[PDB]
């Protein structure tokens, strides 16, 4: 007992769905001693070692330990195809090296439906109105939701964490809040929903206007 632990994190959902972008797997080593700061990383893709990993300069934590992070770029298709990413961590503080493995959630991809809603009758008596965008029937839970007004990014939104449904699929909600006037003056609002099961990972949704 004692000595370093390793934790392994998947890429960011949006990074996995936009081929334009660079998905990364991230290996984090904590409880590295002040004595043996140095950490070697070995990465594997379905068991075969890869060398493109970038290790970040180690960082001193307040509890008198070092934290060391290695970041492995992965290919759009490899990650989505369930390739297996292993992070092996060697330190003089460990008798023998430590492994973790991650891949995408196992299972049968399901395309979501997106339902868009103007504000409820009871909301239309308020200074501020909400525009709701409901996503249900997606598997896995990896997804990206975003809002534009007249193709410009809109930032006053909140998106629930996907919730598991009865049939195994996931459901979530996204709400964008704007001045009643902006809605009434007839501006257009778009929910942008990306999921792997959607064709080109671009889900179709109807824009909202009065
Ligand atoms: Zn080699
Ligand atoms: Zn793709
Ligand atoms: Zn389809």
Author numbering: 235 to 444
Please give sentences taken from the publication describing this entry.
Here we report a structure-guided approach to engineer monomeric Fc molecules to adapt multiple versions of half-life extension modifications. Past efforts to engineer a monomeric Fc, defined as one set of CH2 and CH3 domains, have proved challenging due to the extensive interactions to be disrupted in the CH3–CH3 dimer interface. Monomeric Fc molecules would provide a quick and robust method for achieving structural insight at the Fc–FcRn interface.
To extend the compatibility of these dimer-disrupting mutations with half-life extension mutations other than YTE, we initiated our effort with a test variant, T1, by replacing the YTE mutations in the CH2 domain of the monomeric Fc sequence with a new set of half-life modification mutations in CH3 around residues 432–438. Despite the high degree of similarity of CH3 domains, T1 unexpectedly showed a formation of homodimers. Visual inspection along with detailed interface analysis with PDBePISA showed that the hydrogen bonds involved in the IgG4 CH3 dimer interface were absent in the T1 dimer. Upon inspection of the newly formed T1 dimer interface superimposed with MFc2, we observed that one of the mutations in MFc2, namely, Arg366, had shifted position in its side chain. This shift allowed for the Phe351 from each chain to “reach in” and form a hydrophobic stacking interaction. From a close examination of the structure, we reasoned that the Arg366 shift became possible partly due to the existence of space above the Ser354 side chain. Although analytical methods showed a relatively well-behaving T1 protein, the crystal structure suggests that despite the extensive disruption in dimer interface, there remained a possibility that at high protein concentrations the engineered Fc could be engaged in dimer formation. The crystal structure of the T1 protein suggested that the engineered Fc could be engaged in a newly packed dimer formation at high protein concentrations.
